């Protein structure tokens, strides 16, 4: 019959959960977001619609940090973002104070992934309607990860979703073929400003505002920091000189 | 959410009726038949054995006639599985009020209890109600032989004769025709045998399909006793009767 | 089935808004403010001859300050009634002092929206809106005579003169006219009486008809029917002259 | 999260039925089938280990269980309905019974037990009801030895002999014509094994069969000695050679 | 401890029960009743800490006349008895125990017999043709002992029990201030408003 | 074992004037013979012209004070601004202490 | 953890559950009061689906709240007892707590809450019952009686009628009694009360009960014979025309 | 479609919306017009109250959270209350715990938080009111917009409810002229006023009729309602 | 009525339509698995599939280690391979905690095939589109395999087959053993029994792979671990020196 896509937990005959299938949609009806993997950390960046000139500029930030050395964006329902960021600092809370040691980048993805899922279980709730990067650098160097609505989660060398991620896979699969010695976190942060730049086309209707943020075992000490002033600056100009 | 799977077992028909509670007794009418007849010296339980085969072991069996006290007994139409749970409650009631004020339960506040707990399942909590009716056949000090019986909606009644089950009404045409005051308890037992070899939806009526169970105050000692018939003592009754 | 907390495409809950179906089939009900207190009548609206009137109670005491008059389903008045007694009675335990009628008020409908079969925000167990709108009216050394209209959406609002029930729309237009800054506490017995008459589907008598007033001097009193009845024949009066 | 079904699943229709309880009789029916018989001086239950493959090891999956020393069960319908009835058969039998009085209760408590679990699971909210029927058998010292059937309503009865699923109406008609009161345990396991035989499609070997009987006391399976009142277990399944060894004379 | 004792005669029980209300160094009241009528024919008497001692009877009374109501039936007095031990025996393991002592007297009319009880705050019950709970019965057992018969008429009752008020007005240290007394019998509970001089 | 309690030393009064009124105490918290300030002020001004002080042990003090000044700030949130009484705070404070009947505040205020 | 929602408000205002249960009620049995100068008369109906019953023993319909106050009722027998049962526990405590029996009014307000409740609670349906309260307040001669209902309503009857058929008997009732000299005795006032019942037991001797209610705990019920008596006095005053 | 998707918050909807949500926006559309701007000493909060007959009374739009914070309503009244409340809590523990005032910013995130648990769980229903937050912290004058999908933003101004468009173009115009409105409240205030009368229609605004609150460099939050206001109409 | 098909509740067939759904779920990955018994090592091979150019290869896996005994290779979605491999660590630990010694590979299985046969009854709880085949070599049973599926059925197996092209893989290896005769891999290394296993899985899927197409997990007395990349070619190199 049908119906199979009215509650979450119920699997279609195909074996599929439309409810989770559904919330992807609100995801890529979001902003377009990313992250970048170089040789020592890992870049966040992410599409800011500017609706008006009443917004404060610089001010509605949406990168959240995890801890001291976590970095999470996000695209979809913006609200469901944060409450899952909330859990992940509670997550890694907990864990650094039984262990002493900062939560390792792999067994937070699983925390938010085992919570994630969990949301896929009942249908006395609904599944996120978000699409999460975050990454850090710990013990064994950097590591990037992309969470799905499912639950699904991997390690990546280049993430995007929302709006234009397609056109950001496609620029990040350029920048993977072309280094394979592994990009830096300078020049990451530069790359990021320019598929943040070009996947904006996909909405070249409302102007936006640029935002990145990285985690550089050299450049930040393994500490999760906003890209802001100069460094900030250039990015926007290596962005704005390769778009035209 | 869950609401959707909710039959809503206590709700009202636009009739005022409540839907379970009719089903319910729709079920309970299909049951073996039970008879109970109560005569000047004592209350005779009789009931069909539904659906029988060669290989049941009938001398280990019991499906229709339960011990709740030394001086109550019931006798059960419908779920059996429904009953047990009922009949098991009972008989702890039973002793709870023993243990409180060291004198045995009067009948009536025993059915009373067994059949409030059915009229709960009616008013709340969402659950199907027992499909259970019963005969109950019991003797204290303030009413002698009492004879009631109680349904899925909680109601009971006191009876001089009557049945619970499978043709109901044929069966109570027929003791309402026979039944006199002054009975003695063998002319009981010959009237619950005559009624129930009448409303049959068997071939005959064979010892290997009844259950027989009597409350007397044996002269010749001053107490109440309880009797559940065996097989051959069914037998023997049922060939003096005229039944052979 | 539908929960009983969602939202209409209009943005409106339903129960809430059928609530307010139930309260339009309810007895009429009428409050008038003035600087000499406030009063409040009620259609008593009997079913049947054989019923006792008086053991009508639609107009009820809260503390001495203030009182009430209900319209719709009575029936879940009750523990909004106890509700708001108790929390009268428990601010003057606490402060020494009298509830401000607004306070009173807020109060008895912050038990509105408390209602759901699990509604995140904290225990809401009542499973539907109040049927019923009351008219809570009092007085207080802050901002002296007042009038409320507390529904069962939880939203209350303050009005010169206010009519709720089957007559309400009706009765609404009249003191629209009506009404004035200078009204007597008189001028508002005759006037709630007046309105009453013409809504009421029976006429008007000490019987099937109550008024009430506050005044701060004397607080929350229930007009009998003796003092009723002298109005009533007072108001036959200046309206047959003219 | 929470579960929230807590109403019933399994209600009354118009007819009076109780169709989860119906469902689950269904279910019961294209379960391979079992059987048991009851001789003077023992009890059997049988039934077939329908491999789903070849590459499967037959032996780790048992469908005939011990619950006591003295008491067994096998099934039909759905096996992980019956594994999970199993461990919660075993448990009772501990914590209400021989935690309680000292000593193993009599089967037909037991089954009256396992009854009362699956009698819940037909009314609780929430659930659905188990889809097996069991056939439980057992000895006591003061019922002696003892057949019951338990079906997913949670009602049960006592047998001289019955089947259930798949073939249990046929192979029920051919255990009425060789029962009688005088059956030995030995007549009984062969009277079993040819009504079995019936019922079983490919191989019928001591491989593809599992059986079970309920008899003397084995104090070679006891495990120590030394306590005069503690003989060994009624309880013993016949192994894949005893089985074939009896194949023979079928 | 306060007076409390009880006499069963051939027809009917009879419970006298010391007046005197003492806090402290002052004596509150001396015309106080430690009884209370469980339904028409079972009269109960009570000594022990000074709150719980009330609030006993009256839970226990409102019980049994909830009982009466509901069955529109009047319990045997040995079953009212057995309700009342059961309630003391769970109190005596709660938080904070009911220090209460009580006699039952009543008249079982299906019987035909009067009936006294005797039941200590630990739930200890006993059936008695004369009882007394705390100090009393040291005083006036070897009196009883000794005129004690099981058909006295209940004027031989009173009279005996007057003899035992006597001696505890003769070797007590405290002035419990005369008794109260009662009679249970066929036709009810009544009050000998006449013993301050009878 | 552990004491919940200490005493802070200090002293304080209170004087009503016809239509003013007083309330001084000195500013020296101590704790046995041993002095933990000169100057730590024990009297507060806690609006709607109100001043309180709570004498005896210090923690205590602080935390009854602390209440009682959020209780005002309440006031007015639940009773449009309304002013409150000098009265009404005393029937307040006497339920902020009664509340805590079985592990009082070791303290005695005055208002 | 069953918390339904099983009454609530239907698009016309209206709550369904709660309607359905005065249909319970309307197809219950009819249940009369009439109260007189000095004292109130409760008649009931029995039904005859069934007749082969044990009168000593099958439950009766006018319950003993207390030893002043009865109460009647039409609809859901099982239900009934719950009120029963509650009302008679609120009368013990009331008793236990204020040191007075409860008065008329009291009693019924609480069992109109307890009604009211299940109207408003989740996992829960109301009473299918209406009932009829009446009796004496303590230390007073005036007769009380009155009326409760699904929705948690009640008020004060001169007479009043709950069951099937009450549409009937209430006329008779509202063209039968005169406030102005209500029956002035036990024996008019039972008449009134039979009379009223006639009007839609038809022939019922055994089909008919009365209880009276006096000042000071005096209840008590009439056996066949005593009402047979009523019933043919009456059969009279109709040929006697 | 949308009807069978649409029954509760739990239900995304084959193109990844929530209805319930969404049909909870709409109570603030159909609520009365608030507006509010900020310079860079104070933050300006200009609501029109609504009345339901002339004998009644036009219903408080303004609440105060704290000394230093406060925010406008348009929508369900009652749910304002509850978000109120839980923000007055929030600004009351900071002061309490840690002796600090709460950052308007962080108030922001706290509120889109408890919002956004309404929208996600069984049971419960989406708030039904629109808020904007003005207060002055440790950075200055702020100006926030609270919608009930849980999306809070940082505004310089900005209009909700009935015909909020209106003043929201018009503020978007005079941004460059307001936002230096610097040490001097009452320009601010009339600049809120000449905003909120673009989404005029029905009458204009008077004086039981407009209400306005303020808060900045050296004003603790507070509320001007009836004469208080002649002065700006 | 129709909602027999949504909430695991019988369909008047009899029947569980959402286990059955469940099941599907299973092959939504692709990906195909198997296990064989060596004479003393337990071993899993798995396909595995990198579509995407920008994920991190290494963190791609549906092989677990859920003890330092018991080995796990999941047959369905991730997140719920992810949710039943906490949970089969979680129960490991615990046991050994409770009882004193490792838990036994069968055992587990049982507990895991328990806790889904739950959500089977349950209407609240969904099943796990997953099948689970756990392996190690036990100390009282020497090698082992026990998959368990949505069921909540387990069972224990000489060599077994998972995913879209179970059917060929099966027969395959029944070939094999009705031919040997014997119940496992007569070899006495892990190696050459690695390499029976991916022998096999080439025949039967008429495929080739490269040290990145396979995934591979050892269960030995005592430890049980997976291959790398590098390991796997040594073992790709091997098998190719014989055809």
């Not at chain 3, 017995?189 to 019987?207: A, G, S």
């Not at chain 6, 200490?6 to 918290?29: C, H, K, P, S």
């Not at chain 6, 205590?60 to 009682?68: E, S």
Request: charged share 25%.
């Amino acid at each position: 019959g049908t119906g199979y896509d009215l509650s979450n937990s119920v699997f279609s005959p195909d074996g599929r959960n439309f409810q989770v299938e559904y919330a992807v949609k609100a995801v890529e009806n979001g902003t377009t977001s990313i992250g970048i993997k170089c040789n020592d950390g890992v870049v966040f960046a992410v599409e800011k619609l500017i609706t008006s000139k009443l917004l404060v500029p610089q001010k509605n930030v949406k990168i959240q940090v995890v801890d001291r050395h976590i970095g999470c964006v996000y695209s979809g329902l913006i609200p469901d973002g944060r409450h899952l960021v909330n859990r992940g600092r509670e997550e890694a809370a907990s864990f650094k104070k039984l262990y002493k040691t900062p939560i390792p980048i792999p067994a937070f993805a699983d925390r938010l992934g085992q919570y994630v899922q969990a949301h896929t279980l009942y249908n006395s709730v609904r599944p996120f309607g978000v699409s999460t990067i975050f990454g850090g650098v710990d013990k064994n160097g950097a590591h990037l990860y992309m969470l799905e609505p499912s639950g699904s989660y991997w390690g990546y060398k280049g993430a995007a979703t929302g709006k234009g991620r397609q056109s950001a896979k496609a620029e990040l699969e350029k920048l993977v073929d072309h280094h394979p010695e592994g990009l830096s976190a300078r020049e990451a942060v530069k790359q990021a400003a320019k598929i943040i730049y070009l996947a904006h086309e996909d909405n070249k209707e409302k102007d936006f505002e640029l935002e990145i943020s990285w985690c550089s075992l050299s450049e930040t000490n393994g500490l999760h920091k906003f890209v802001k002033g100069d460094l900030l600056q250039e990015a926007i100009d290596f962005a704005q000189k390769e778009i035209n | 959410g869950s609401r959707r799977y909710d039959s809503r077992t206590t709700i009202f028909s636009p009739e005022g009726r409540l839907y379970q509670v009719e089903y319910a007794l729709e079920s309970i009418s299909h049951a073996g038949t039970a008879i109970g007849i109560m005569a000047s010296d004592g209350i005779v339980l009789a009931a069909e054995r539904k659906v029988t085969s060669t290989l049941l072991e009938q001398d280990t069996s019991t499906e229709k006639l339960y011990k709740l006290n030394d001086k109550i007994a019931v006798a059960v139409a419908g779920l059996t599985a429904d009953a047990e749970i009922l009949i098991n409650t009972a008989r702890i009631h039973a002793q709870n009020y023993l243990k409180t004020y060291n004198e045995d339960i009067p009948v009536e506040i025993l059915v009373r209890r067994l059949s409030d707990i059915k009229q709960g399942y009616t008013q709340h909590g969402g659950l199907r109600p027992f499909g259970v009716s019963f005969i109950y056949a019991g003797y204290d000090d303030r009413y002698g032989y009492q004879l009631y019986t109680s349904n899925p909606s909680g109601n009971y009644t006191g009876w001089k004769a009557i049945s619970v089950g499978a043709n109901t009404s044929a069966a109570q045409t027929l003791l309402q025709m026979d039944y006199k005051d002054d009975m003695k308890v063998d002319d009981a037992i010959e009237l619950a045998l005559k009624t129930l070899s009448k409303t049959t939806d068997s071939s005959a009526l064979t010892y290997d399909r009844l259950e027989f169970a009597t409350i007397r105050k044996g002269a010749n000692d001053g107490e109440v006793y309880q009797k559940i018939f065996k097989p051959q003592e069914i037998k023997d009754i049922l060939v003096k009767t005229g039944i052979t | 089935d539908r929960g009983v907390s969602t939202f209409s495409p209009e943005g409106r809950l339903f129960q809430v808004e059928y609530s307010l179906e139930a309260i339009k089939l309810g007895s009429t009900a009428i409050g008038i403010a003035t600087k000499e207190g406030v009063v409040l009548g009620v259609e008593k609206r009997a079913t049947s001859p054989l019923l006792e009137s008086d053991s009508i109670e639609k107009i009820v005491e809260i503390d001495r300050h203030i009182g009430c008059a209900m319209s719709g389903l009575t029936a879940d008045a009750r523990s909004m009634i106890e509700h708001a007694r108790t929390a009268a009675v428990t601010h003057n335990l606490y402060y020494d002092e009298d509830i401000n009628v607004e306070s009173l008020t807020q109060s008895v409908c912050d038990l509105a929206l408390r209602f759901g079969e699990g509604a995140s925000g904290e225990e809401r167990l009542m499973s539907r809106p109040f049927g019923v709108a009351l008219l809570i009216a009092g007085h207080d050394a802050d901002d002296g005579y007042q009038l409320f209209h507390a529904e069962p959406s939880g939203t209350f609002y303050r009005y010169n003169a206010k009519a709720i029930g089957s007559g309400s729309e009706g009765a609404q237009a009249e003191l629209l006219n009506e009404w004035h800054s200078s009204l007597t506490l008189k001028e508002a017995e005759l006037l709630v009486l007046k309105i009453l008459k013409q809504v009421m589907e029976e006429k008007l008598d000490e019987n099937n008809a109550q008024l009430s007033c506050i005044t701060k001097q004397d607080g929350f009193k229930i007009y009998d029917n003796e003092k009723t009845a002298e109005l009533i024949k007072e108001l036959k009066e200046k309206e047959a002259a003219e | 999260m929470t579960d929230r079904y807590s109403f019933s699943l399994t209600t009354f229709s118009p007819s009076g039925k109780l169709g989860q309880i119906d469902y689950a009789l269904t279910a019961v029916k294209q379960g391979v089938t079992s059987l048991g018989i009851k001789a003077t001086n023992g009890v059997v239950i049988a039934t077939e280990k329908k491999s789903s493959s070849p590459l499967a090891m037959s032996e780790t999956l048992s469908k005939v269980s011990l619950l006591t020393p003295d008491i067994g069960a096998v099934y039909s319908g759905m096996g992980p309905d019956y594994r999970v009835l199993v461990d919660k058969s075993r448990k009772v039998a501990h914590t209400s019974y021989k935690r309680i009085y000292g000593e193993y209760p009599p089967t037909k408590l037991l089954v009256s037990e396992v009854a009362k679990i699956m009698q819940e699971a037909t009314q609780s909210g929430g659930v659905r009801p188990f889809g097996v029927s069991l056939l439980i058998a057992g000895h006591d010292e003061f019922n002696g030895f003892s057949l019951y059937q338990v079906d997913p309503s949670g009602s049960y009865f006592p047998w001289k002999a019955t089947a259930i699923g798949k073939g249990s109406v046929a192979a029920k008609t051919f255990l009425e014509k060789r029962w009688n009161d005088e059956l030995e345990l030995e007549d009984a396991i062969h009277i079993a094994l040819l009504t079995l035989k019936e019922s079983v499609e490919g191989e019928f070997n001591g491989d593809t069969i599992e059986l079970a009987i309920i008899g003397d006391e084995n104090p070679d399976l006891l495990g120590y000695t030394g306590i005069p009142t503690d003989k060994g277990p009624r309880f013993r399944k016949l192994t894949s050679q005893e089985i074939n060894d009896r194949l023979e004379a079928l | 401890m306060d007076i409390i004792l009880g006499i069963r005669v051939q027809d009917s029980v009879i419970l006298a029960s010391s007046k005197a209300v003492t806090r402290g160094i002052s004596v509150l009241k001396d015309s106080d009743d430690k009884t209370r009528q469980l339904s028409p024919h079972t009269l109960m008497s009570f000594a022990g800490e000074a709150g719980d001692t009330v609030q006993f009877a009256e839970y226990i009374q409102a019980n049994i006349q909830l009982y009466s109501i509901r069955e529109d039936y009047e319990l045997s007095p040995q079953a009212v008895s057995s309700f009342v031990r059961q309630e003391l025996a769970k109190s005596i393991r709660s938080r904070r125990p009911y220090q209460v002592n009580v006699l039952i007297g009543g008249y079982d009319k299906k019987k035909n017999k009067p009936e006294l009880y005797q039941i200590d705050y630990l739930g200890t019950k006993v059936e008695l043709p004369y009882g007394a709970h705390g100090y009393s019965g040291f005083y006036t057992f070897s009196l009883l002992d000794h005129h004690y018969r099981p058909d006295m008429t209940t004027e031989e009752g009173l009279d005996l029990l007057k003899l035992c008020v006597q001696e505890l007005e003769k070797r007590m240290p405290m002035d419990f201030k005369g008794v109260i007394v009662k009679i249970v019998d066929k036709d009810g509970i009544r009050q000998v408003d006449d013993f301050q001089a009878q | 074992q552990f004491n919940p309690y200490g005493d802070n030393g200090g002293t304080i009064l209170g004087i009503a004037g016809e239509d003013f009124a007083v309330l001084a105490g000195d500013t020296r918290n101590i704790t046995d013979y041993s002095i933990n300030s000169r100057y730590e002020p024990k009297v507060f001004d806690c609006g709607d012209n109100i001043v309180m002080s709570a004498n005896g042990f210090a923690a205590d003090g602080d935390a009854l004070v602390k209440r009682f000044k959020n209780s005002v700030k309440w006031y007015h949130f639940d009773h449009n601004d309304k002013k409150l009484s000098i009265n009404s705070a005393a029937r307040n404070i006497q339920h902020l202490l009664y509340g805590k009947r079985f592990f009082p505040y070791y303290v005695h205020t005055i208002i | 953890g069953y918390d339904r929602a099983l009454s609530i408000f239907s698009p016309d205002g209206h709550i369904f559950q709660v309607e359905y249960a005065l249909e319970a009620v309307k197809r219950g049995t009819c249940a009369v009061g009439v109260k007189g100068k000095n004292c109130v008369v409760l008649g009931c109906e029995r039904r005859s689906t069934l007749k082969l019953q044990d009168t000593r023993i099958t439950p009766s319909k006018v319950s003993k709240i207390d030893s002043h106050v009865v109460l009647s009722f039409s609809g859901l027998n099982a239900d009934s007892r719950i009120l029963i049962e509650k009302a008679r526990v609120e009368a013990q405590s009331h008793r236990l707590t204020l040191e007075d029996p409860v008065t008329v009014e009291y009693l019924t307000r609480y069992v109109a809450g307890v009604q009211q409740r299940y109207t408003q609670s989740g996992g829960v349906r109301p009473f299918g019952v209406s009932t009829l309260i009446a009796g004496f307040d303590p230390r007073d001669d005036e007769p009380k009686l009155y009326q409760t209902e699904p929705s948690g309503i009640y008020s004060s009857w001169s007479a009043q009628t709950i069951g099937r058929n009450s549409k009937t008997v209430r006329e008779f009732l509202e063209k039968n009694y005169d406030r102005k000299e209500p029956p002035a005795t036990v024996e008019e006032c039972v008449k009134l009360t039979v009379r009223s019942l006639l009007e839609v037991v038809q022939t019922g001797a055994k089909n008919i009960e009365i209880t009276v209610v006096k000042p000071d705990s005096d209840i008590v019920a009439l056996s066949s014979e005593e009402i047979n008596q009523y019933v043919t006095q009456i059969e009279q005053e109709k040929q006697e025309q | 479609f949308r009807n069978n998707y649409d029954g509760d918050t739990v239900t995304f909807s084959p193109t990844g919306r929530l209805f319930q949500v969404e049909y909870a926006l709409e109570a603030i559309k159909q609520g009365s017009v608030t507006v509010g701007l900020r310079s860079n000493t104070h933050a300006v909060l200009v609501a029109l109250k609504r009345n339901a007959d002339e004998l009644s009374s036009y219903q408080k739009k303004i609440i105060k959270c704290d000394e230093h914070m406060g925010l406008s309503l348009a929508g369900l009244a009652p749910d304002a209350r509850v978000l109120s409340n839980y923000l007055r809590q929030q600004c009351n523990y900071s002061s309490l715990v840690f002796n600090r005032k709460l950052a308007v910013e962080r108030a922001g995130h706290l509120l889109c938080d408890k919002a956004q648990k309404n929208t996600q769980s069984y049971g419960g229903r989406p708030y039904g009111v629109g808020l904007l937050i003005i207060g002055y912290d440790k950075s200055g004058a702020h100006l926030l917009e609270f919608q009930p999908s849980g999306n809070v933003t940082e505004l310089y101004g900005t209009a909700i409810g009935a015909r909020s468009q209106g003043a929201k173009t018009y503020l978007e115009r005079t941004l460059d002229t307001f936002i230096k409105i610097d040490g001097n409240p009452d320009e601010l205030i009339k600049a809120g006023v000449e905003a909120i009368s673009q989404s005029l229609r029905d009458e204009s605004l008077t004086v039981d009729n407009l209400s306005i609150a303020i808060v900045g460099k050296d004003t603790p939050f507070t509320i001007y309602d009836g004469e208080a206001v002649a002065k700006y109409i | 009525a129709g909602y027999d098909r949504h909430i695991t509740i019988f369909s008047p067939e009899g029947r569980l339509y959402q286990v059955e759904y469940a099941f599907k779920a299973t092959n939504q990955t692709n990906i195909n698995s198997l296990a064989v018994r060596g004479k003393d090592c337990t071993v899993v091979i798995s396909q595995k599939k990198v579509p995407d150019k920008l994920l991190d290869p290494t963190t791609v896996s549906y092989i677990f280690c859920i003890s330092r005994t018991i080995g796990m290779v999941v047959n369905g979605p991730i997140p719920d391979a992810r949710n039943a491999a906490l949970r089969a660590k979680a129960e490991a630990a615990e046991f050994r905690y409770k009882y004193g010694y490792d838990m036994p590979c069968d055992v587990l299985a049982k507990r895991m095939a328990n806790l889904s046969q739950i959500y089977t009854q349950r209407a609240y709880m969904r099943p796990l589109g997953v099948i689970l085949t756990f392996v190690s070599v036990d100390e009282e049973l020497g090698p082992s395999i026990y998959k368990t599926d949505p069921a909540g059925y387990y069972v224990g197996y000489k060599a077994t087959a998972t995913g879209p092209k179970q059917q060929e893989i099966t027969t395959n290896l029944e070939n094999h053993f009705k031919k040997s005769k014997i119940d496992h891999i007569n070899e006495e290394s892990w190696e050459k029994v690695v390499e029976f296993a991916i022998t096999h899985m080439i025949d039967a899927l008429g495929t080739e792979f490269s040290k990145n197409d396979l995934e591979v997990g050892v269960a030995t007395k005592d430890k049980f671990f997976t291959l790398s990349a590098e390991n796997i070619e040594e073992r790709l190199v091997a098998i190719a020196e014989q055809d």
